[PDB]
């Protein structure tokens, strides 16, 4: 059938190439796109080709690119290859863009995801010249139906001088109805409105993004797919991690520190997460509820098994198999999923009110339980902080999960001092590795260290950590959080120098 | 007249020493007390004495002490002197207690102030045996009127097995009515209640703390003053910082990024604050509003002048001459002030909704604008994170202010890498020192560094900082946040070893050329 149901807006249809010409060197461009879902695809490719051409002619041609979160090859990839992004925010997972960032070729700032809309309204990224947004359809009354994520799209539409819409036939038409877009003041000028959400399942808005049709300068009909998560399954390391956490939850319920149905669940991006969700799929906790940033394979499975009743998120992140599963049964799943603006899904006010349990991955933690989520050796960007801070600090319980080692045992995920900190001690109560679980609630830093070292550290590294800690306790400037500054970062330098943190 | 207006409770009145006997070795004790205001005084003194006696006889006697925030000499001081505290949370400014913490004699964890109540209810500190709370009065129906702070007192009252009240006749009776205590679910079991505050001057509750009178085991009549620590008159460094900040505010207003009345202001604990507040009282900005953790001298002044229309906080933080002024006019100041539970004053939902401007001190920041508020050389506690995280992360604008050097120039407040992090780059947008102001909005880390180094760092240190940065850019494992791990913490180690961050010219340093 026809995706552009507003007749007058059909007159605005044009080629991706023509549309890209609307984007000028220096422009700030806000796009849809979150966890590889729902980003614009055709216009960016054409922009990319035109950028390389201009460069070869000695013509400066770059943009600032603000998204919901991560995109995909068509967007971050192509623009990165063309060397056409001078600034990027707030979250990337594309390899080429990552290389531009780590080479100092593209400036990057990974804002808390729930804050981006507000900072954009404040003007932190500059004036938005363009909003480039992917849509499933356009309603008769000119509503824009989003695709597989909401992200920041409503805000970008509000802000931008000109609007380009990509309407993508690839996206399932039955997405229409799944989203909840609130017309309230969440990220606008203070004083903001109270967001009246008191239950994860509660809808407070409507199914479409709103925009003034006068701002729409081009509509481009497209047909191309989102990225998929890898299908692969959780290994023995992940399963052990899931096992410790599930036992922990069990003991909390017995002590009456959690209800039998737990609390609204936030599961982060990563593979350790899927182990946990798979664990919960066949777990003893019924009538679960998700209040997260993303719907991954694991959550989809739990909605399937009925072990989870409903899930709130801003986006999808699904394997091709999971994607197929949902696109066949969209009517079933649609009644169990709510996609929200990311400034609502990641609202600290709402997260705390609902009492979410936050479960996130990490690069590394130090012995005191400070967490690095982002910067390897302190300087090389992986993905970004994303929403891990939004959730960790606001949660009822903040949990970080990781293999105790990386790179085949050549790196310890528990270190004397983190090379970069994303989450301070105060924002992390529980740590889990395949070695065990450390419950840090109510503990001082020295007490946190004893737990983390004995429970979580790999046997190969535990004695080295105990050696560091003992000598710090003896020789540190202060004894509240004992360190030896001459060796605090020495394991990282050793990896840099030798390829392993294990001494020779 | 009587401060205890409920007849039935009068029979529970007893001497401080006797009340203190209710507190046993190993007890978890929650007390009133926030920034030198409203903490209990006589019972802790008596308790300290008995602890010392037990110790002298080889008998153990220590408590876990959980407060609103910092207390004063009568409580933190006396107990630390007696070595009577095995665990302390969440915030302390007493020098003796600080020494116990830094020697490893008292275990310490500085929780975000707005989260303490919820973590207590969750059971993180264990079961509360005693709540010890200072009061102005007890009402006819048994309500407890708090004194110069609210803090966590309501939560401690709810949780504790037994309750002790100190009724302090030094505290002005006209404090009654200044407090706003909510029966709503702010820090209890989820799902919590919506906290419906949509203006800084809005009251949502009532004037008294509520407690089952059956739990009140003792009441002590007292008469002793709060720790009205001395007014630190702003020096030229502080004034310069304030000048740059006020110029910034003026600019934001001129560019229509702030209303002429600014937005609700949070001013952190510290000495740079007085400069800022003094600057604001002379400034061009009218109809100001405070939504803060504390009310300090500078705020009282603007309330008196009408420059500030209302001030919301959990506590007072006044100089003796400031307690003096307000005492003579509590009648007047009571209509300009609202004292709230700290889980409400420091609620991230509310702070964001109101759009607070956060202004906080710091120990140090690295060139990328990560902030240390707590741990000198990374291991020695100063005060604690307090509510700086509550406010920094939730604010409309997050501003950190500090002298560019410390220890008479022997330490640079801008460093290659912070020795400890309290506020990540994402939580800090504006930096101000006496050297200038760095506006970091929309910048990548490398861009942040160029601004911080050029605007904020002291001239004595900027060449060294630029040298680090330049060489990191060339050599760092990654170029997103360039570091040289061999040197990152070397200025701190130089200070530990030699008492200065400055290099000795007797040896090479790449910036010396
Ligand atoms: S929406 C709310 C939550 N959002 C976030 O948490 C955003 C930030 N978090 C993330 O980016 C991921 O959670 C990270 C922290 C990268 C971990 O992801 P995983 O859970 O999938 O863990 P993996 O073991 O699979 O690691 C993935 C890649 O990261 C590398 N890595 C992990 N740990 C280290 C250490 N200590 N040192 C170096 N590298 C490390 C892994 O090597 C892996 O990368 P590869 O390129 O595949 O080797
Ligand atoms: C960080 C903090 C101590 C700074 O206080 P300040 O009055 O603004 O700054 P000052 O320059 O006067 O220095 C205060 C102390 O810190 C020390 N200090 C400051 N910077 C230092 C540095 N870079 N290295 C070593 N010591 C430093 C000073 O020497 C002084 O210590 P002293 O009493 O032993 O002489 C203070 O703001 C604080 O404790 N913050 C945490 C709580 C908070 O921010 N709450 C917010 C809501 S109220
Ligand atoms: Cl809200
Ligand atoms: Cl805790
Ligand atoms: Cl709320
Ligand atoms: Cl920003």
Swiss-Prot record, chain B:
GO biological process: acetate catabolic process; acetyl-CoA biosynthetic process from acetate; succinyl-CoA catabolic process
Phenotype upon loss of function: Cells cannot grow on acetate and have lost the resistance to high levels of acetate, a characteristic of wild-type A.aceti.
UniProt-annotated binding residues for CoA: 268-272, 363, 383, 387, 407
Gene3D superfamilies, A to Z: Acetyl-CoA hydrolase/transferase C-terminal domain, Glutaconate Coenzyme A-transferase
GO terms assigned for molecular function: acetate CoA-transferase activity; acetyl-CoA hydrolase activity; transferase activity
InterPro entries, A to Z: AcetylCoA_hyd_C, AcetylCoA_hyd_C_sf, ActCoA_hydro, ActCoA_hydro_N, NagB/RpiA_transferase-like, Succinate_CoA_transferase
Variant or mutagenesis effect after changing residue 356 to Y: Strongly impaired protein solubility
Enzyme Commission code: 2.8.3.18
Cystine pairings recorded for this chain: none
TM annotation in the entry: none
Pathway: Metabolic intermediate biosynthesis; acetyl-CoA biosynthesis
Modes of activity regulation: Subject to competitive inhibition by coenzyme A (CoA).
Record's catalysed reaction(s): succinyl-CoA + acetate = succinate + acetyl-CoA
Catalytic residue list: 293 (5-glutamyl coenzyme a thioester intermediate)
UniProt keywords, alphabetically: Transferase
Superkingdom: Bacteria
Induction: Expressed at intermediate levels during the first growth phase, when ethanol is metabolized and acetic acid accumulates in the growth medium. Up-regulated during the second growth phase, when acetate is catabolized.
Database matches in PANTHER family: ACETYL-COA HYDROLASE
Record's subunit section: Homodimer.
Function of the protein: Utilizes succinyl-CoA to convert toxic acetate to acetyl-CoA and succinate. Required for growth on acetic acid and for resistance to high levels of acetic acid. Also has low activity with acetoacetate as substrate.
Family, similarity comment: Belongs to the acetyl-CoA hydrolase/transferase family.
Protein's recorded name: Succinyl-CoA:acetate CoA-transferase
The organism's taxonomic lineage, starting at the top: Bacteria, Pseudomonadati, Pseudomonadota, Alphaproteobacteria, Acetobacterales
């Amino acid at each position: 059938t026809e995706r552009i149901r507003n007749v007058a807006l059909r007159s605005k249809v044009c080629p991706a190439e023509t549309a890209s010409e609307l984007i000028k060197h220096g422009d700030v461009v806000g796009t849809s796109g979150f966890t590889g879902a729902g980003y614009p695809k055709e216009v960016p490719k054409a922009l990319a080709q035109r950028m390389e051409a201009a460069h070869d002619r000695g013509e400066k041609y770059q943009i600032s690119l603000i998204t919901g979160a991560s995109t995909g090859p068509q967007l971050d990839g192509e623009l990165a290859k063309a060397n056409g992004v001078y600034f990027r925010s707030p979250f990337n997972t594309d390899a080429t863009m990552r290389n531009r960032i780590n080479a100092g070729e593209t400036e990057y700032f990974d804002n808390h995801l729930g804050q981006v809309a507000g900072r954009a309204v404040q003007g932190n990224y500059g004036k938005f010249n363009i909003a480039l947004v992917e849509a499933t359809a356009i309603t008769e009354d000119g509503g824009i139906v989003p695709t597989s994520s909401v992200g920041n799209s409503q805000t970008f539409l509000n802000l931008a001088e000109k609007v380009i819409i990509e309407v993508n036939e690839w996206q399932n038409p039955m997405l229409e109805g799944i989203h909840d877009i609130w017309d309230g003041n969440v990220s606008g000028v203070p004083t903001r409105d109270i967001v009246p959400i008191v239950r994860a399942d509660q809808r407070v808005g409507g199914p479409v993004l709103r925009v003034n049709p006068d701002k729409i300068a081009a509509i481009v009909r497209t047909n191309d797919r989102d990225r998929n998560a890898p299908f692969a399954a959780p290994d023995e390391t992940a399963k052990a991690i899931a096992g410790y956490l599930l036992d922990f939850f069990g003991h909390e319920v017995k002590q009456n520190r959690l209800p039998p149905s737990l609390l609204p669940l936030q599961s982060g991006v990563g593979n350790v997460a899927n182990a946990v969700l798979e664990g919960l799929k066949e777990g003893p906790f019924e009538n679960l509820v998700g209040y997260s940033e993303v719907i991954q394979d694991g959550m989809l499975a739990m909605l399937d098994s009925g072990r989870m009743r409903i899930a709130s998120a801003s986006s999808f992140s699904l394997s091709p198999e999971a994607a197929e599963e949902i696109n066949n049964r969209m009517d079933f799943f649609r009644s169990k999923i709510i996609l929200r603006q990311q400034d609502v899904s990641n609202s600290p006010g709402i997260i705390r009110r609902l009492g979410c349990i936050a479960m996130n991955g990490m690069i590394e933690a130090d012995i005191y339980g400070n967490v690095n989520s982002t910067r390897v050796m302190g300087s090389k960007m992986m993905n970004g902080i994303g929403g891990s801070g939004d959730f960790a600090r606001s949660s009822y319980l903040s949990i970080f999960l990781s293999p105790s080692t990386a790179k085949g045992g050549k790196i310890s995920a528990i270190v004397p001092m983190a090379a970069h900190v994303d989450h301070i001690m105060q924002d992390a109560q529980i740590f889990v590795t395949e070695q065990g679980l450390a419950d840090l609630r109510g503990l001082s830093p020295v007490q946190r260290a004893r737990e983390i070292i004995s429970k979580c550290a790999h046997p190969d590294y535990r004695p080295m950590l105990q050696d560091y800690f003992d000598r710090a306790l003896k020789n540190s400037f202060g004894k509240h959080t004992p360190h030896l500054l001459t060796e605090a970062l020495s394991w990282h330098q050793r990896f840099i120098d030798t390829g392993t943190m294990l001494p020779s």
